[PDB]
A paper describes a structure:
S-Adenosylmethionine (SAMe) is the principal methyl donor of the cell and is synthesized via an ATP-driven process by methionine adenosyltransferase (MAT) enzymes. In humans, there are three genes, mat1A, mat2A and mat2B, which encode MAT enzymes. mat2A and mat2B transcribe MATα2 and MATβ enzyme subunits, respectively, with catalytic and regulatory roles. The MATα2β complex is expressed in nearly all tissues and is thought to be essential in providing the necessary SAMe flux for methylation of DNA and various proteins including histones. Here we report the crystallographic and solution X-ray scattering structures as well as biophysical analysis of the MATα2β complexes, providing the basis for fresh insight into this widely utilized system in biology.
The crystallographic structure of the MAT(α2)4(βV2)2 complex reveals that MATβV2 interacts with MATα2 through the insertion of the C-terminal tail of the β subunit into a cavity created at the interface of the MATα2 dimer. The complex has four active sites located at the interface of the MATα2 dimers. The synthesis of SAMe has been proposed to follow an SN2 catalytic mechanism that has gained structural support from the crystallographic analyses of MAT catalytic subunits bound to various ligands. Briefly, the reaction is initiated by the sulfur atom of the methionine which carries a nucleophilic attack against the C5′ atom of ATP followed by the hydrolysis of the tripolyphosphate (PPPi). The structures show that two of the four active sites are occupied by SAMe or adenosine whereas the other two are empty, thus providing details of structural differences that accompany SAMe formation by comparison of empty and occupied sites. In all of the structures the adenine group makes a π–π stacking interaction with F250 of MATα2, supporting the hypothesis that the substrate (ATP) and product (SAMe) can occupy the active site in similar orientations. In addition, the N-terminal loop (residues 1–13) of both MATβV2 in the complex, which is orientated to the same side of the open active sites, is disordered. This observation raises the question of whether the N-terminus of MATβ could regulate the gating loop of MATα2. In our case, co-crystallization and soaking experiments with an excess of NADP yielded crystals of the MAT(α2)4(βV2)2 complex without NADP.
Residue numbers in the entry:
A (entry chain A): 15 to 115, 135 to 395
B (entry chain B): 13 to 395
C (entry chain D): 100 to 149
D (entry chain F): 15 to 90, 96 to 323
The structure:
Amino acid sequence: EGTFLFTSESVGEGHPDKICDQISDAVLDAHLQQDPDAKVACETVAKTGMILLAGEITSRAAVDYQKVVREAVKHIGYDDSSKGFDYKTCNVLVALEQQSPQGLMFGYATDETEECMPLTIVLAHKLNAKLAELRRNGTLPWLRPDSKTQVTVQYMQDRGAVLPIRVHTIVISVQHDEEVCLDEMRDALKEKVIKAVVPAKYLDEDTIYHLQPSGRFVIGGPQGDAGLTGRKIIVDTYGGWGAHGGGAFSGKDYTKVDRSAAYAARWVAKSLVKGGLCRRVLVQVSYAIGVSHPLSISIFHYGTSQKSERELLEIVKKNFDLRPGVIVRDLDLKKPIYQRTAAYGHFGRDSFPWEVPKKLKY
Amino acid sequence: IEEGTFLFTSESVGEGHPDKICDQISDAVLDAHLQQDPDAKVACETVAKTGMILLAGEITSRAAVDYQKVVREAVKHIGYDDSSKGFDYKTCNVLVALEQQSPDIAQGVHLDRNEEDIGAGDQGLMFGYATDETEECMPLTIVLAHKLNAKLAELRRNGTLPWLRPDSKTQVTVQYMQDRGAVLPIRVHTIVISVQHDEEVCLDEMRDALKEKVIKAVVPAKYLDEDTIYHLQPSGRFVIGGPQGDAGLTGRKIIVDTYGGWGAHGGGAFSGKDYTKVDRSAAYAARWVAKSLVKGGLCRRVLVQVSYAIGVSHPLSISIFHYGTSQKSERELLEIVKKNFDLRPGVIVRDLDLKKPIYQRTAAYGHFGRDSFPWEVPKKLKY
Amino acid sequence: DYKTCNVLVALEQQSPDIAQGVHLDRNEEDIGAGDQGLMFGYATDETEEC
Amino acid sequence: IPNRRVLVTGATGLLGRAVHKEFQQNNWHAVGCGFRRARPKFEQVNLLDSNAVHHIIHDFQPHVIVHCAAERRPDVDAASQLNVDASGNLAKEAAAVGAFLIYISSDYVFDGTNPPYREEDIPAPLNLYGKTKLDGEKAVLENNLGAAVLRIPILYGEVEKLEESAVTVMFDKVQFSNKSANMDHWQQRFPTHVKDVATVCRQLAEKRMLDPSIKGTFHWSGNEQMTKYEMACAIADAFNLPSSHLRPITDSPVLGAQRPRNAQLDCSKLETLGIGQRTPFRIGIKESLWPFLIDKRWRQTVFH
Ligand SMILES: C[S@@+](CC[C@H](N)C(=O)[O-])C[C@H]1O[C@@H](n2cnc3c(N)ncnc32)[C@H](O)[C@@H]1O
Ligand SMILES: C[S@@+](CC[C@H](N)C(=O)[O-])C[C@H]1O[C@@H](n2cnc3c(N)ncnc32)[C@H](O)[C@@H]1O
Ligand SMILES: [Mg+2]
Ligand SMILES: [Mg+2]
């Protein structure tokens, strides 16, 4: 009928891979606080009782890695062996080689949500946030940090844009304790989590629910599955929408164009949609060796713009300066707020500079 | 003048790039297990670093596997065998942090089930993609990027360019034109090649060699012209490469492994994973479907999405986008796919023969666009 | 905690150079010392266990 | 590996593509060329540069040349222009190598007063387009007596853009039912598939390898007679759409004096030799235009 399904996932703070992303960016943050010009390329690996730091750092800062990693794991919620991991007793190994002193990026934006993101991933992200919140409250005290979610939305194509109709399927898997029973978890996940996150007009009697579909989820965190930095890049970005060139974000400082120009491309894309010029847009920025400005910019507006691609490009050229140096200045990327980006997606939340739409002048 | 033109770029990396070292080691470990135990449950993550290979993850298997030997033999084959190259298989540190698969995952996925009923090893989404712009049904950008690295490795291993080392990076920028939903590659705009090298060989002997022996042997002359930009060894002194002064991980080149930016990706990595992990088997399945549709003449370009819930056998969703390159509707193409394919992992494993220990082959030069793989052989469709 | 601690394994084969110098191709009774070294033994009548 | 060589000029255009395709597949070693947008499938050749034309023909040694003009008819104002001439050079150098040149020409060389028109009939163009097509025939025939001339009417095919054919330009006006659209119901025309014309070009060339007597003018055309208005209604019928928003203008257009009313070509000479293919228009235009359906075009993006 012109109808199609699309699926996206997200994960919780206690997910092994997301643990590593947060620690990687926690290391970055800590370095940037003492030394705004610190070069960081910090990978984290997680497994039963182990956090391993590995990478290159050119920094003047003196960082207590012990404290950084342990406080991160604490915040995440892993504070006892009964939960599979404990910040107080885990092994922290440091293998960073410290010293003393191109690309294709994509930005994407869709008018299907206030946050200008695909509904599928927004919901996926928010379901994990809810679990974390209800775990920390004490409202559902059997919850544990590690969790995954997946949302399938039924869309209708509408002249370039995509129109959410309903939620087709929802998956929630969340690590839990040994007392709570399967029916109580499933009732709770449905009534306290989903129904508080998803607008009622998207839910109906045909919506399929796979809640705790594995049946048991006691063993979790790095014990149940090894974690690595940079292994959730689709979760970090557009959940299968838009496009992606290859680069992971976390553990990398702002001088890596993989991170900061991806942020800028997002900024442009969101500005075009919030500025009413597109209902939906994908922005391609080609950078090339030996040029500051992008070598080429393409703008796929899916036919949702009254203005042509050349017109939109011209609008982009006089409102934006996409030279790395200017990007870090304009978006304030030397500041130590990278850890908050390392869970729940880098795009979607207003608190980030690249999610503040620029008022366009043309 | 512009029309509906655009630039697109894809990279590939050679076997010695630290990330791809991890991918190949993880797949060697998987193959080692499948040689003795075809039903092995493998989730091997590898970490590569100055002087170190660490194995972390989980494996339940009946195989007796000597991890020190498999890891060191892999690094040997990759070509790191001396301090001069920054890494030596004979003397590198090899740590192992491998445990059994979580019993909670076992009971919830595969225990006491008929093969066709085993659940997805995880939740996830996977994409499959095909395009008629090359014989291999792949984007020209990524195909050229892969084949350049493969050429470098070839010319290194048959001694014809003995100054080459294992680490390399290529980027191929092609100029494209849109054609009713398909894409016509017009010309190769730019080619970058960085490759690790001897102390002796001079800069412009390498640059001459990269153009005349590598690019000329790989890229059809029809795509090369006087304007094509060549960035051969752009920085200059790239003698330091591989793990030394660097840190790589399994599953940090997933875009290189697949479509090089084209189509889409759901973010699941391939290497170190047996068939029960649908990140691999369903992605392979979805490539097979996308290639079958294009080779079967039903469209010129296509993207397929599938999704799964852990412990559930049937896909949660399936979707087809033909970019308006088919006379038939996307819904009609979906109906055709539903009739011709069974996308449960318990069935995909039979159709694609995924217990065979042939995975190390896939860990470099991309998992798609090659002759020998079952998922690259299109299915004759009935509709 | 035994259940949740990190365990890392870095075990390789005995050096082939050691093996050939010590025990390969010999009757067990003619096995060489695994290494050089000195060792003491001691006893005292002050307790029953010496 | 095939030894039978052919050179198609204007290979970038709707007609050329179809011709180069029809040959290449059927055991010919087909090379195409074009002035702009030729690369990567075809050779970049400016027909007005004699040095370029010389080198590619010298190096290729074609056993046959099929001379097509790119074309993108707005024409169908019907005035100017052409500086060719270059069909002269092409005829010159085709003879120098001993290649059989097929010159594509038009029914616009005629008056369009006494249909049908035979190959023997006296031409009388009412416009500058008809004039230069007639000049080309002259310029070719007198520079090469071993050459042929295939006259054809209005063209359509599997276009890359709607504007590549004066039949296919109408398709948006057909589709948009919410706006009324005027279309010519005065000029009589015979829409003809370039795929049909291509088959004819292969059959005719394959005869000249046997029999050296094949030369002079020839006529091919589709058998279905249609106005611009009747074509539009036929397109709607093929895709099952309403056509009541289409209004015919039986009055001749602003420059009706420059447009031959009915320049129907008599194809009897060519029908005799067993040369001829006729894809029905309702089946031909369906295969031609489906990629340009509104709903398809919405979907035709680079990314999903
Ligand atoms: C299932 S695991 C990946 C496969 C695993 N490496 C294995 O050995 O089969 C991936 C993620 O699923 C989640 N997970 C772990 N145990 C689970 C269970 N028993 N049920 C559902 N989800 C689980 C965790 O978030 C974990 O990081
Ligand atoms: C023989 S090793 C102990 C290794 C252990 N006993 C074994 O065989 O696995 C102790 C020391 O002897 C020396 N050593 C090592 N290899 C040797 C060899 N092939 N012959 C003689 N001495 C050796 C080194 O100084 C080393 O620290
Ligand atoms: Mg993972
Ligand atoms: Mg995984």
